Design a protein around this nucleic acid. Structure first.
Ligand SMILES: [Mg+2]
Ligand SMILES: [Mg+2]
Ligand SMILES: [Mg+2]
Ligand SMILES: [Mg+2]
Lengths: 132, 86, 133, 101, 118, 195, 113
RNA sequence: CCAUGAGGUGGCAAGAAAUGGGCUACAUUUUCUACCCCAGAAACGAUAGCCCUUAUGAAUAAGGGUCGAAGGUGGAUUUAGCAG
């Protein structure tokens, strides 16, 4: 019995989505990697820096867009430019959405001295994979 | 042979290395000042970005009141509870 | 209906210095997804065909590195957890390729990267003999 | 705001070792060389001995960044095995598969 | 004897100018500055104005935070140093009439100039 | 309160400028994409998840941009800019005859903000001595000096250069090294004449 | 010149308008220089102050104040060898190394053994 | 919460003893020599100790000389194993 990146089976009255529904030994078989970079490949370096920085990205963005997200993010790093993809709920106003988007994007660009972009997909209610 | 010895001398004079013979404790200096020390290599100097910077940034940003820190809300709520209960 | 009249074309100058002659542009793409690698390779070969240059491709073997971790935290030497990093190689060689063609094609592809891929250029260019020899 | 005072000490040691890395290499070469005067070698030895503490790169330790665990830390990723397993299970990092071969 | 094509020189932006002129404007699509999803899709002039103004206000907020706490972003992690990304410094130096006068035209205000004339 | 407009599927016509609606790399944006393709582990008596909440299509790399039509268009556009290779050079023997001194550098490119990487300094070069030396004494001298930088099977002398961090510094050092090496192989010494 | 710059920035503000294309965004990023300059030579900048391979490797001109046989000569020749082998420490760092060594054995010149 | 927190010097980390897991060998299928398999000799065994050298360190490991013994297949208390 191993407990790792898996949700306990409940009565069947709580939504669960694809990524946490599937096991961590199903990552490459039936999932995709959340972060996209080449530091893990051979010949590259700074993999520790990549991991720490992208973990900080995820933390800061999850906590600066609280209550609207319902799933993990998608990071896409093609050379210099960084891209983020999020799925959120239509809870708060588009005013707040755009304001926080611009604010956080400017902060990340200024901090990492790097071109950053981010996109968001609104959903009325978080898509459930199954009821476990 | 002296011929091969002088061949090596010329090759060293051409490619940079010392022509005169040298011991291993003398090539020590060569390879030391060739390869940088671990203390100077950034692998040791910068083992990770500064928790100082990160935590100070997030603390000031909470003081601004934008990042709803769940862990900090937990901590200070239980702090309030303990200071209420004595 | 909206079709522009005068298409703005960038300025170009043919400097007096002659362009460099690359003997071989050998690019090596390292990836994690063989399908993504195949798509990128199709893209590259189609671009090279449309630009009018020779092409060739072959797939070096998959390289894997694994290392064992203790599955639990405190005391469990029997039960470990394993991982593997798989890097997949793909090569593309281009011969009889001019310097400016190299510039334009590499700019195109370098803007057309996907994310999870590493790209290694090896450029082979011939030149004449020096004057001091 | 480091994880703990042992991490604080380790970072101080690393900083000192870096900001006196060159001089240590120079005098260590001047020591370990053999053909030079042995009295000069001894001078360099006593100079190294008089150098301050926390200045050598041997006292530092390749600790983890997240949980401050000294042992079971990979030099490449700099993360403890536990946090590595954490992130691999959460699929946060890229291009790592379970070796079910 | 031998034929060699002549070398050419391009601007870093010229290639992308070509790529852009290659493609026409998107049809039946809002500006690229606006998002793509339908909920965030600005569907009126006044609301779109307010939206990109909120974005500009976030940009100004970013400027304010960076010029209020420069030391946080002081790290030049990126290999190419960029003053556009470096934090901004409108800080008068120590009392120095000559250097203060030279810094007048750098600070772009009037109180410093009044004090310097004084 | 607010309500989102319906997706662009019905709005987009059947004849449509896909290279224009997707000029550069961008997310999948199912609201804009009319294709109903799904991807996901189908549940028992079920099917994969719909394209809307299918974040795994975003996880995987994205190639909706740059369709085959887009690639055709951009290559037709850049055909005017790209130059042509000399027709006289159509074989490797002819190319190495015209320009014997081969030289090659290399470097990776990886995702991240920084771009320097030590391997940027490495370079190597090659030249066959069958046609360059034109003599025997200096040839024997040079082959005695060099230990393994040569290989007579394919008949090319190869030498690397990374002693300098800059590629141009490595290049200039290799050129000057070859020059001085030829100048020093030209002459000889009495201990070399005595063998 | 000053008022010319004022009028130039005014004209630039009048010109600047929001973009509509990712290609235009890329043009802007390359304008401010954050976007990498293809081809990636990994050396766009950092030319080592126009230093040269001979300035890096040949320290014979820096080595003048001691004979060509002594133990200080031996040590400093090995130093120059190692420095020339090291590419990244530039001519500056090499001359600071040699300066510190000069100071060392000249302040310990009381021996000459 | 003048501390049960924090900072800097040192040693601590041995065995009268029993036991566990691994290495060496209790021989001639062994030991040595060149090759790894058509040969020739011996009739073995120190990964411990003493001395010296070397690797990095500011301050254990490998190598060289000496020491050349214990040791004589324990069986059903019980370990691993169904083929590469
Ligand atoms: Mg188990
Ligand atoms: Mg240590
Ligand atoms: Mg205690
Ligand atoms: Mg030691």
């Amino acid at each position: 019995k191993n407990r790792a990146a898996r949700v306990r089976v409940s009565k069947g009255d709580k939504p669960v989505t694809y990524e946490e529904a599937h096991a961590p030994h199903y990552i490459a078989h039936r999932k995709g990697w959340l972060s996209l970079h080449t530091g893990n490949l051979d010949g590259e370096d700074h993999a520790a820096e990549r991991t720490v920085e992208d973990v900080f990205l995820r933390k800061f963005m999850w906590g600066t867009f609280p209550g609207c997200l319902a799933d993990q993010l998608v990071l896409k790093r093609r050379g210099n430019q960084l891209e983020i993809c999020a799925v959120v709920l239509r809870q708060l106003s588009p005013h707040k959405y755009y304001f926080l988007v611009g604010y956080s994007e400017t902060l990340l660009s200024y901090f990492y001295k790097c071109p950053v972009r981010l996109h968001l997909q609104t959903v009325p209610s978080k898509v459930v994979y199954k009821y476990l | 042979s002296e011929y091969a010895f002088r061949m090596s001398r010329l090759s060293a004079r051409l490619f940079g290395e010392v022509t005169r013979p040298t011991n291993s404790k003398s090539m020590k200096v060569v390879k030391l000042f060739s390869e940088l020390p671990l203390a100077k290599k950034k692998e040791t100097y910068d083992w990770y970005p500064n928790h100082h910077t990160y935590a100070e940034l997030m603390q000031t940003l909470r003081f601004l009141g934008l990042y709803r820190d769940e862990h900090q809300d937990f901590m200070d709520e239980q702090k309030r509870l303990k200071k209420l209960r004595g | 209906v909206d079709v522009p009249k005068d298409l703005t074309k960038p300025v170009v100058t043919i400097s007096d210095e002659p362009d460099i002659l690359y003997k071989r542009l050998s690019v090596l793409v390292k990836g994690h997804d063989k399908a993504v690698l195949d798509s990128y390779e199709y893209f590259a070969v189609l671009a090279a065909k449309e630009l009018g240059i020779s092409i060739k491709v072959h797939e070096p073997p998959r390289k894997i590195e694994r290392f064992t971790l203790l599955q639990s935290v405190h005391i469990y030497k029997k039960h470990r957890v394993q991982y593997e990093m798989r890097t997949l190689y793909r090569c593309l060689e281009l011969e009889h390729l001019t310097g400016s063609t190299a510039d334009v094609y590499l700019e195109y592809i370098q803007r057309n990267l996907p994310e999870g891929v590493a790209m290694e250029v090896t450029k082979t260019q011939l030149e004449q003999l020096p004057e001091h020899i | 705001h480091y994880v703990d005072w042992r991490m604080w000490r380790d970072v101080k040691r690393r900083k000192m070792a870096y900001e006196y890395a060159d001089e240590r290499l120079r005098i260590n070469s001047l020591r370990k060389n053999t053909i030079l005067p042995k009295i000069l070698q001894d001078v360099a030895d006593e100079e190294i001995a008089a150098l301050p503490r926390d200045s050598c790169p041997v006292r530092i330790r390749n600790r983890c960044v997240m949980t401050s665990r000294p042992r079971g830390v990979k030099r490449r990723w700099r993360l403890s095995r536990i946090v590595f397993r954490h992130l691999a299970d959460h699929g946060q990092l890229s291009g790592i598969q379970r070796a079910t071969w | 004897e031998v034929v060699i094509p002549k070398k050419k020189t391009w601007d870093k932006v010229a290639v992308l100018q070509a790529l852009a002129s290659t493609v026409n404007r998107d049809t039946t699509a809002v500006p690229y500055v606006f998002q793509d999803d339908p909920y965030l899709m600005p569907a009126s002039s006044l609301e779109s104005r307010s939206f990109l103004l909120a974005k500009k206000s976030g940009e100004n907020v970013a400027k304010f935070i960076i010029n209020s706490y420069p030391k946080y972003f002081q790290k030049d992690i990126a290999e190419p140093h960029i003053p556009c990304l470096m934090p901004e410094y409108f800080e008068p130096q120590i009392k120095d009439i000559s250097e203060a006068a030279l810094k007048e035209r750098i600070e772009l205000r009037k109180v410093k100039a009044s004090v310097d004339m004084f | 309160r607010r309500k989102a407009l319906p997706p662009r599927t019905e709005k987009m016509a059947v004849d449509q400028d896909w290279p224009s609606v997707y000029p550069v790399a961008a997310p999948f944006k199912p609201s804009a994409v009319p294709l109903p393709v799904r991807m996901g582990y189908p549940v028992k008596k079920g099917v994969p998840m719909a394209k809307e909440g299918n974040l795994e299509l975003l996880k995987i790399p994205n190639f909706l941009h740059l369709t085959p039509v887009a690639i055709k268009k951009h290559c037709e556009a850049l055909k005017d800019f790209c130059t042509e290779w000399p027709a006289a050079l159509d074989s490797d023997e002819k190319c190495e005859k015209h320009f014997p001194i081969e030289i090659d550098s290399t470097d990776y490119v990886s995702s991240g903000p920084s771009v320097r990487n030590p391997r940027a300094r490495v370079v190597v070069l090659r030249v066959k001595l069958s046609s360059l030396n034109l003599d025997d004494h200096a040839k024997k001298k040079l082959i005695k000096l060099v230990g393994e930088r040569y290989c007579k099977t394919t008949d090319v002398l190869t030498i690397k250069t990374d002693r300098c961090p800059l590629r141009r510094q490595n290049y200039d050092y290799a050129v000057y090294l070859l020059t001085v090496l030829y100048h020093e192989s030209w002459n000889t010494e009495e201990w070399e004449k005595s063998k | 010149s000053l008022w010319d710059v004022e009028f130039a920035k005014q004209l630039a503000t009048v010109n600047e308008q929001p973009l509509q294309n990712g290609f235009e965004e890329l043009i802007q990023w390359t304008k401010e220089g954050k976007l990498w300059e293809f081809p990636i030579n990994n050396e766009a900048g950092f030319d080592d102050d126009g230093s040269e391979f001979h300035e890096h490797i040949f320290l014979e001109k820096h080595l003048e104040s001691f004979p060509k046989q002594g133990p200080i000569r031996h040590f400093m020749e090995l130093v120059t060898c190692g420095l020339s082998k090291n590419p990244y420490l530039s001519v500056k760092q090499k001359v600071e190394h040699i300066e510190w060594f000069r100071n060392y054995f000249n302040e310990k010149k009381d021996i000459l053994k």
